[PDB]
């Protein structure tokens, strides 16, 4: 391997071997079909609202979510790189597809597939992420960063639907060798939202730009209908001319077949015919290809660009609204603008590059932090981009000054902004995008006193329930096969109007939102201010028998939605307790003085009271009512852990604190598993794991981040990194179950799975505060 050394790669960067197996890996633990995609996978490209493309560690562009809302795991086999050399004095030259793999059936057998084991390593440091060709059979060595400018603070680039793969190639020998690179793209417009008829009318052309000291050459792949669809729009790959290296292109070949006549023209001699071809398909899919061919002289290094666009302005989901993405404020609404949109990545890309170095380089120079920490706390960033992330500019037939935004709870549960796991999962939003996370919680606020009388069977007990209450705040903003943003509370598994935790984690957010963005935001408190106060007089009403704390219904009424709490729980008392404190502080900055006086009244009863039912003088007990009320709760303080971040003081005494959290890192981290797994969320006082429900047998990914962060903030720095790394080691270590860029909700102590691709472990992001 020379070519590490012509490149950049953080030594944090996840790592794995090209075409490597991964023996270890989980699968789910459940009863009905959940999504399990295997572990071949990698970090995706595309921006916030975009649609995105994961192409694998294997190379294969395979993990699909150009859908809104939707997770499609199939490898488009025309979709690769592909690379020739040919030694100065031989008769013939190698040509190989850079993909450890093949297709399934007889298309394409023309082409070099199955490339070689040990020949090559991919890694990943999010956005970022490279392979590098290290193969005997290539003389020359090859290296790609390819990328989409995902940039803190910034909502323009961040929401393009664009990656940058940018090649350097070196050769370490002492013979001359004449090296191509091509680029290969199928027209994929029908590959969804096409009832019939999935090719007709696709056609392909070539833009050749030219401009003093600038060649572009590219491909644009698109239909010869100018309607405005969900599946219409346009695809475009390309290249940007630089010293040394000549362009050629194929405008059409037919991926339904064969791939010779695309194949004999590259394994030849590395040259494509420049054909120009723009007519349209019928049934056949068809393909662009665009490459480079260059001369290496022994010791030489060239540097040469490559990016794809798609443009596909109109998501729709399933109750049938359609709107148009974000992007399109930048580049337009027709769908026939992905040349523009690579343009502009192929002439910037230096730029993006530095501007993403730039927000990464506090973290990755900081030599107190462990390159594990680093891996994971980049890495799992990954998912506000392959969410199901929605963010809309206008529907379609409509201006308004906002633009609402929507992130997956994940893809076997399609709830959008489910509020109570977003209380973990929205910290980089918070800290990085803070535009959006204000926006987001807006949308909550005004959903407070929405009513909706219709009834919905709730799913646990087949029970019906009025689908929205005025004064609660909904659990989501609806499901991608339903009406984002417009029908509220999808979920149906338990009724969120008498949820007990909702309520007080919007305003725990709220207040989290002011606080972490500088305490200056007057405007967003008075937005949320009627909100808030709603909310919390609403949960006051929940307290049946007057000791000040909402009473959990012994069903289960709060995020752990198979979990049943009664009573005064250590979870939902806790926040409770630190939403009063929040309301308030914002009392205070708002000068609503009988808000301040009637929330600090409230707040000194539901202490008192908190205190004296569930403190043991170890810890605090799971709740007052319940069979198993004297189990050790992972997130018990979940509460005190806001307060700490919103600086709200101690809601509990700091002595009981920290007997609490050395409790569960003692008992819910270290009894289980050795301490290697993370913290599993229900202990018994006698050291076995609690039994009365399997999410008290399941470590929760984003609950265990975050208590980590809780620990850090008490001082308890190696229990913290401890807790934490059970995490980073489980989703990305050769030990672990393979799941990089799909880190689930949770596993049972078998290291087996729930609902990968989830939301809350974003919250390694609180580790950050
Ligand atoms: C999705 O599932 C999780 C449990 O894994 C719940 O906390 C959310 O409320 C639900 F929408
Ligand atoms: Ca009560």
Same mark, same amino acid.
């Given at each position: ?65 150009? =859908? ?81 400018? *995902? ?25 001359? %060798? ?33 401009? !003093? ?25 390309? %290249? ?10 194929? +405008? ?8 010779? &006549? ?15 071809? =723009? ?41 049938? &609204? ?17 040349? /523009? ?16 170095? &730039? ?25 506000? +981009? ?22 997956? =709870? ?77 029908? *509220?509370?999808?979920? &149906? ?8 935790? @909702? ?32 909310? @919390? ?68 009863? /539901? ?24 189990? *050790?709760?992972?997130?018990?303080? /979940? ?8 600086? @709200? ?13 050395? !409790? ?24 076995? %794991? ?17 208590? +980590? ?36 909700? /949770? ?23």
């Amino acid at each position: 391997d020379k070519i590490s050394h012509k490149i950049d790669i953080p030594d944090s960067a996840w790592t794995i071997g090209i075409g490597e197996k991964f023996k270890n890996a989980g699968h789910p633990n459940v009863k009905y079909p959940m999504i399990d995609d295997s572990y071949v996978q990698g970090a995706p490209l595309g921006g916030f609202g975009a649609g995105t493309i994961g192409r694998t560690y294997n190379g294969g562009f395979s993990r699909w979510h150009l =859908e809104i809302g939707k997770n499609k795991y199939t490898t488009v086999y025309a979709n690769q790189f592909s690379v020739f050399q040919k030694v100065e004095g031989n008769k013939d030259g190698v040509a190989q597809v850079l993909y450890a793999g093949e297709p399934e059936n007889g298309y394409l057998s023309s082409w070099k597939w199955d490339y070689p084991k040990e020949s090559g390593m991919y890694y990943a440091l999010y956005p970022n992420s490279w392979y590098t060709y290290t193969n005997k059979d290539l003389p020359v060595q090859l290296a790609v960063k390819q990328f989409s400018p *995902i940039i803190p603070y910034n909502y323009k680039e961040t929401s393009y639907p664009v990656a940058v793969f940018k090649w350097t190639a070196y050769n370490p020998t002492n013979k001359n %060798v004449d090296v191509s690179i091509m680029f290969t793209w199928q027209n994929m417009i029908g590959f969804f939202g096409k009832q019939v008829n999935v090719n007709s009318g696709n056609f392909n052309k070539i833009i050749k730009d030219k401009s !003093k000291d600038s060649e572009i050459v590219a491909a644009v792949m698109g239909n010869i209908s100018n309607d405005n669809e969900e599946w219409n729009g346009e695809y475009s790959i390309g %290249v940007k001319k630089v010293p040394g290296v000549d362009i050629s292109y194929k +405008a059409k070949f037919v991926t339904t077949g064969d791939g010779s &006549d695309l194949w004999h023209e590259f394994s030849k001699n590395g040259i494509l015919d420049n054909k120009d071809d =723009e007519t349209p398909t019928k049934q056949d899919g068809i393909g662009s290809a665009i490459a480079v061919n260059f001369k290496l002289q022994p010791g030489q290094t060239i540097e040469v660009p490559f990016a794809l666009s798609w443009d596909l302005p109109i998501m729709k989901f399933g109750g049938g &609204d359609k709107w148009y993405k974000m992007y399109t404020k930048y580049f337009g609404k027709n769908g026939k603008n992905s040349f /523009a949109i690579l343009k502009e990545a192929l002439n910037n890309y230096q730029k993006w590059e530095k501007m993403i170095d &730039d927000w990464q380089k506090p973290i990755l120079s900081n030599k107190s932090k462990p390159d594990w920490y680093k891996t994971a706390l980049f890495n799992e960033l990954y998912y506000l +981009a392959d969410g199901g992330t929605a963010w809309e500019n206008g529907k379609v037939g409509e201006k308004r000054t906002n633009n609402m935004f929507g992130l997956l =709870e994940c893809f076997d549960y399609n709830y959008y902004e489910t509020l109570d796991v977003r209380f973990y999962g929205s910290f980089p939003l918070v800290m990085l995008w803070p535009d959006i996370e204000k926006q987001v919680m807006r949308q909550f606020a005004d959903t407070i006193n929405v009513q909706d009388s219709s009834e919905f069977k709730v799913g646990s007990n087949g029970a019906m329930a009025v689908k929205k209450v005025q004064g609660m705040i909904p659990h989501d903003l609806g499901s991608s096969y339903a009406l984002p943003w417009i029908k *509220i509370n999808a979920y &149906d598994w338990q009724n969120p109007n008498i949820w007990k935790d @909702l309520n007080s984690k919007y305003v725990l957010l709220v207040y989290r939102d002011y606080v972490l963005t500088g305490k200056t935001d007057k405007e967003f408190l008075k937005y949320t201010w009627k909100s808030v106060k709603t909310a @919390l007089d609403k949960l006051k009403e929940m307290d049946k028998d007057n000791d000040g704390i909402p009473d959990n219904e012994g069903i289960p009424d709060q995020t752990y939605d198979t979990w049943s709490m009664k009573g005064t729980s250590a979870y939902c008392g806790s926040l409770w307790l630190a939403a009063l404190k929040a309301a308030q502080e914002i009392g205070k900055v708002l000068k609503d003085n009988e808000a301040y006086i009637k929330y600090n009244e409230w707040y000194k009863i /539901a202490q008192q009271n908190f205190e004296k039912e569930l403190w043991n003088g170890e810890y605090y007990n799971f709740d007052t009512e319940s069979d198993h009320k004297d189990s *050790i709760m992972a997130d018990q303080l /979940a509460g005190q852990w806001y307060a700490d971040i919103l600086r @709200l003081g101690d809601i509990l005494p700091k002595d009981h604190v920290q007997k609490a959290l050395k !409790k569960i890192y003692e008992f819910n981290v270290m009894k289980f598993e050795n301490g290697k797994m993370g913290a599993v969320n229900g202990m018994r006082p006698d050291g076995i %794991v609690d039994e009365s429900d399997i999410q008290a047998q399941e470590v929760w990914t984003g609950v265990t981040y975050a208590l +980590a962060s809780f620990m850090k903030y008490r001082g308890m720095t190696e229990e913290a990194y401890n807790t934490a790394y059970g995490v980073y080691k489980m989703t990305y270590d050769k030990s672990g179950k393979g799941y990089w860029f799909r880190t689930p909700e /949770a596993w049972t102590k078998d290291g087996n799975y729930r609902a990968s691709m989830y939301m809350r472990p974003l919250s390694i992001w609180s580790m950050e505060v």
